[model samples]
Target: GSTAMATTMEQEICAHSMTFEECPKCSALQYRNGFYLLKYDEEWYPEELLTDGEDDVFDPDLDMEVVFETQ
Candidate 1:
């Protein structure tokens, strides 16, 4: 039962591509793209430093997949 539930969550996460963006609400680093932020649909919000610079543009078509982990 738990395994199936976990699979569902994984699918939900995988279905939408994630992007790094700054949250206007809390100034926290949000792991959400423009679409998710606009629609208010988010599952995780990992906080980190604001390292993304002007050169690192968010492109939906980019194939690069970044995986974030917590320790």
Candidate 2:
């Protein structure tokens, strides 16, 4: 059903774009190229990776938005 698909997508995306407080790469900020709507064949996956730097804190103050998902 559509609901199932939506829920599944939500869960999958959530798992990927986990909050900085929850992710190991929390300090990483701002997405890179091909962040969202990245295509692999016919599938589009949200970009969950961020740039890591010495200034990064593993615990960023701001929440990063992943494509179509809300922070």
Candidate 3:
């Protein structure tokens, strides 16, 4: 039972954050916002939706730096 849950759920930093975490089972990046989590296929929704139509910009390119490491 714990193994099933472990496979289905994981914890990591937001992709928008400088730090990153890779999924051990599937080798994927996990992203989060506060407690909000995102899967590799899922992406952060539009700024307006989170802001209720108010203006908010979250530019991934500008907000976070991405680094690729060969392992």
Q: Please provide TM-scores, in order, for all candidate models, with all chains considered together.
A: 0.13, 0.15, 0.17
Q: Considering lDDT, which of the candidate structures 1 and 3 is the better prediction for this target?
A: 3
User: Per-model C-alpha lDDT, please?
Assistant: 0.37, 0.37, 0.39
lDDT of 2 at 33: 25
Clashing pairs in 2: 27-58
Candidate topping TM-score: 3
> In model 3, which regions exceed 4 Å deviation?
1-39, 54-71
What is the per-residue lDDT of model 1 for residues 1-71, given as tens digits with 9 covering 90 to 100? 45653233332321123322323333335434231223334545433224453433554356965667644
> How well is each residue in 6-70 modelled by candidate 2, as lDDT tens digits?
23332222123444234444324543222211222333453433444435465567687678765
Model 1 segments beyond 4 Å from truth? 1-23, 35-71
Clashes of each: 0, 1, 0
Clash pairs, model 3 backbone:
none
lDDT of 3 by residue, 21-57 (tens): 3333323354333121244444455556666543445
Off by over 4 Å in 2: 1-4, 7-49, 55-71
lDDT of 1 at 51: 45
